Symmetry: D3
Subunit: 300 residues, 6 copies
């Protein structure tokens, strides 16, 4: 994400006030800081539209619901927080907002979610975040961590939460292998996802990606699958192995921030970055997020 001096003077939304980023703060009694106890969303602003905005806010509401966290706001109010954060920083384009809603402040740090004073802590950081396509062109080195995605009875990886050491530990190992991102296997040993992005492989003209049973169900992921199906591109959504990845023609990772990022290697096995099907899906994706489809909520 290619740097920008405007990032240094962005205003941050904190419980209704707009604060210089150097002074944007939360209490050391906040459930987020203490316990990792909240949910969050990343949404990208493209030519005056927030990409998949309503989808992201639905997901936030579902994730909060799953950990019995009261956002303290209607869907409309939650969206206006994001809209006002972009507006306050004069952003219409090339911008990314992180919306963080943590459970709130506690009289004393504990795990019990009932003992909360006020309501949810709401933070929105909006920044200038444009991927310089030298990063697109070279792509990512992936290493398959020894650390596994969890089953939902242990920790549901569909939740976009403030408790992220599970993923960070996978990343640390991949970095120590000389890589940029971690590929993770599911509890059965099949390819699941990456530590911060979803994972796709390309094999004989077809797009392969996990079931999503044991990883984050990214909106970029679901859009890319949808565009592929709509374009008549065969999709295999289900169980595949490292052997199938190693013999793949192409691969890429997805997320709101980078979009489609090519993979140049997995476990040291080279893949041509920006193969022909990655390019085709990339074209479809960028067309979709830059279009007047109102899945992309219009900025006031």
């Amino acid at each position: 994400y290619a740097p920008d001096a405007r990032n240094d003077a962005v205003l941050v939304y904190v419980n209704g006030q707009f604060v210089p980023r150097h002074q944007a703060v939360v209490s050391v009694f906040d459930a987020g800081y203490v316990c990792g106890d909240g949910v969050w969303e990343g949404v990208r602003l493209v030519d005056g539209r927030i990409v998949s905005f309503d989808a992201h806010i639905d997901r936030m509401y579902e994730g909060a619901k799953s950990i019995a966290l009261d956002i303290g706001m209607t869907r409309a109010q939650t969206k206006q927080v994001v809209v006002d954060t972009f507006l306050r920083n004069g952003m219409r384009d090339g911008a990314h907002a992180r919306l963080m809603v943590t459970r709130g402040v506690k009289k004393t740090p504990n795990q019990d979610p009932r003992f909360i004073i006020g309501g949810a802590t709401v933070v929105c950081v909006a920044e200038h975040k444009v991927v310089t396509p030298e990063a697109k062109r070279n792509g990512l080195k992936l290493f398959t961590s020894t650390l596994r995605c969890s089953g939902p009875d242990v920790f549901d990886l569909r939740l976009k939460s403030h408790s992220r050491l599970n993923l960070i530990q996978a990343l640390i190992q991949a970095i120590q292998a000389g890589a940029d991102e971690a590929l993770m296997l599911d509890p059965n040993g099949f390819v699941s996802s990456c530590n911060s992005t979803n994972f796709f492989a390309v094999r004989n003209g077809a797009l392969w990606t996990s079931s999503g049973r044991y990883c984050f169900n990214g909106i970029t992921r679901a859009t890319v699958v949808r565009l592929a199906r709509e374009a008549g591109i065969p999709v295999h959504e289900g169980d595949f192995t490292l052997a199938e990845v190693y013999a793949a023609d192409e691969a890429f990772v997805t997320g709101t921030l980078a979009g489609l990022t090519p993979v140049s290697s997995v476990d040291g096995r080279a893949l041509v970055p920006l193969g022909p099907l990655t390019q085709r899906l990339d074209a479809l994706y960028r067309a979709y997020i830059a279009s007047a489809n109102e899945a992309h909520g219009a900025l006031p």
Copy 2:
């Protein structure tokens, strides 16, 4: 933990400064708040000695090491932070300190642990925390959550971390069952631990507790096992079932904060709280933490 107006005016240690608790804050760019990315310790102050102090600080150093987090301080400096926090609030007794060390502030929120400006964020909250023995006498209702302790390849539960939604989710379900705390099973179905405390059962004069393979290895836990062995009390450290708990004579939970807290029921099956062996071990425990054993680091 029976309330105290002195709690409202405690000074909090934050990166070297002492701050009123109403104004003790960390950046919304801090790895703790964003990612749940740090380690912590609770230590109890008893008659001018910090209980098991050196043990807790060793554990912190090991946990930080496991997630490649630089505390940025020697063991001596880390202890002086705690000592000075107690000292600054005029505490010699009936006090508990939470020491929180999060990875630090980032230019932009991400998972990558390398992109850190300055070093570790260090917070120490010291409070007046005395359990009113009406809480001892009645004990806790436990419910066995459907949510499981993880294996170490998924998320090592020996780590005392800022990523706690795994445990909090277990708690939420136990509360909805009408209970106070959650009992958790290991991935094989055997009794592991509670969501915020360790778990013991008593059967025919013997103390039963998990292997600790799949839960937090509490210092209170290890002290209680040690005192029991030293007193000739038979200990079974290993795999046991809910059936064995349900047929138990007594049970209790351990942690720095409450010490030994009796259990009055598990899954609705009554147990006499403060049975005769809980009382005996409780006597030994309190004697140990109030003694001039220098495992209890002496306050300057």
Copy 3:
């Protein structure tokens, strides 16, 4: 399922004879009583027709086959036992028959299935069983037990057997949570079924239910899936989580006895009982069981 004094004088089929309910008995040497060793079926009589009758009898024959149990009767003879049980109690409507076929009497209690004198014990209990729709309207509290559905290499839950402590133990825990029925997870942590009924959730106008890989594949379940597809309702058969359940709009359970029973809560998270799609499917189901249909067996 709301009382009727005719229940006290029903005749029970026992190995070819019809016996007063207070005198209907099996030997203490019977494999059913000793070992839980048999299969059973519940079939409902509606307006002169046995609902899905041949489906139930095929299932019985497959289940018996799986545990190498010789029913001792043709499909025709098995059906006539049920038909004659209804007939003997003058039942045309609002009645339920339990058909129990246990392995038989043994010289001595053991598990060896070959040491059997005579054939299968065959019992049929028919009762007057109408759900008073105040039970429909208020619905069930569900609690997700810590006890799991098994895989087929442990014990295949497709079998409708006399060995039911696996399910009853899940129920006992849910009752102690203040609930009416137990929701059960599969060995991978995904929602599977209830202890005595199959489980559906409703989310965004679609119906969600397990794969059935790890639970009882109820005929009511399969009928409701078919009716939903018939009526243009999207159906998602597969792996879903407690998070997805907790965010659902409606939920209900299925079985021959109650039909569709709404769910009022799961793990303490409230759901409005008799939501709009539960109503719709309930209407379709009742129409189906009261129609002439070739799936239904005619009473003479």
Copy 4:
């Protein structure tokens, strides 16, 4: 268990009454028949003593407790049921009693354990059951079933219950392999137990048996381990494999009914039945069950 015509006329205890075996019956509404919903115990009478009697009754009370089943009786009363069953059939020796306590009768068959009329159904079948030591000498063929012991969160195998299709299905497969009993693996693939007995192997003059974390913790099992430790026979309670079994010098199975029964093969691999250590442990066991030990309950000389 080598046959005896007296078995045909034994009286059976059924809720306080003593009934001819041809007429010993339970209601078709009983949770035992319907749901497999009860616990049971087998106890052996040897020379006027019920072997390990209080241990069996403790186990019953714990197992009942685990499925929230009220036996309806004190430990004393439960024992008298067994004692009276032996007494009523004039049995002083060479006899086995199966005590079955099911949850009771229900107004309608369901799973809900609350809706019970009366109390527990209590049945006690006592029979003349003496193993003719030609059965000892030849021993059992074992086959390792594909069907697995469960973990405790699925179904705890320490419970001696009326729900036995889990074990029966393992047996069915072993019989179809030409064997007499099923060996079962635990969820991790280590040797656990047999479908109706516990399992021991002998290797390098030491005794090997499972941890018991994933199988029935037999009283015969616990006695054999204790006698071995008392006698300086090395005993290893823990995880071992089929490879270790296949290389073993001897093996045997334990249970109240047969005592120690030698194994003649596992998965087709021959083992000499009644090897030297099986014999030695067998001698110790029989001496123990024929002793005046206060683990054994006195039968009245009545």
Copy 5:
């Protein structure tokens, strides 16, 4: 595979040379012999065509790629090895070639795949292998081994490798049960495959086979599924149980060597061999392998 004296004098391809079968040899330093470290393929010659030839060669190249093994040859060259082996033995029909490519010779036996002198060892054994349809008619006894298919993070069973003790051990147990082949379960307990062939069951006029997530994805398997779908025979690729197998009307196993082989029993439960749907699929398969389809590679009329 019903015998033929010509098998005794076949020439074997060994790194470019054609050698009498009595003298076809590899070094004791070869990774294949030492470590089980190679991939292989079986291909069948039918009326001048190598059945599914390019599919087998694709699979080999993927499997080699998965264990970072350099075959040392283009796809073209690899095919010519097979073609020349058939040609050298004057085989136009009724013949099977096993192509074995092991990692090569090492200066010293170790696991490290880098320290290799020369390239891959390439062996091709072609034999006369025609199944006498008395073997078709009677079919196979299956026993479900206690030994399990692995997940891909333990050992991926899609790889056709020189490390086969995992499958052989399942076979050993099934033979000791009186059977001919082993049925294996997946890590979750569902039916996966057989130790040397894929597994199908027939139930209510539909064909059932595993997902293939936990077993060898046979080309015969994939062909049979495709022919069934093409013909409007319902096919269910997914998880099913032993209970479903035991209640099945028919079953069969697939592989390049035998084609479709009926099953006469599973765990002692009899199945009529060559049931009506097995026959129909068998007819379709034989027609397919005897067709001019561009899936099949031409053998020179040389």
Copy 6:
């Protein structure tokens, strides 16, 4: 293991004959080459004694027994093959023999073990193999592969077999991470062993190593455990984690070929090679293998 031109002219034992290394061959019909179907042993010759010789031969006999492979030889005859291989190459010291017994030649390649003509193929390769202690001093980089040790119902890793792609695949990944050897986890996630050697860690003056339930139970491993207990060093055989490894003071790997080899890093976390306890145990081991001891077999 540092080169010697005598290796080029060693004679190899092949079914009773002694053959030049360049001409030592097995049939392409041999179960070893085709199927990986055999067992092997490495034994080291030190100052006229074969280290732990009878232990290795007992192990071979047990492994063969487990896969129903008839060695075709008494223990005495098996040993004489090794002894004669050493003798024929004039080796008294600094030599290693690999004894390979594969199932034999088959009429046709298949997996069925009964279709064997003649008996076991027996091969013995003896070489001059001295570790130049610059290899000792620098030690090994370890990477924890994503590929797991199996349980015994999948494939028992106590067996020293000719089917080694399970271990080699773990190695390939570790090499691609920039490491020398692979650390492997057990099916529960705990540290098990290395791909070709056993694994120890040192923490606070104690030695830690796996239970051996899920890996090769090396003779060097058992010797080092025994020497440690002999020398008053606490030994912890059981389940431990990557976190515990990462915080360790030292680590090393064991095997007949190298003896004790220090570890310089695990997953990129540095460990000082030849720490004080590794040195101590290394001294004890070398003393042991150079002593007269009854465990050692005398060369004639």
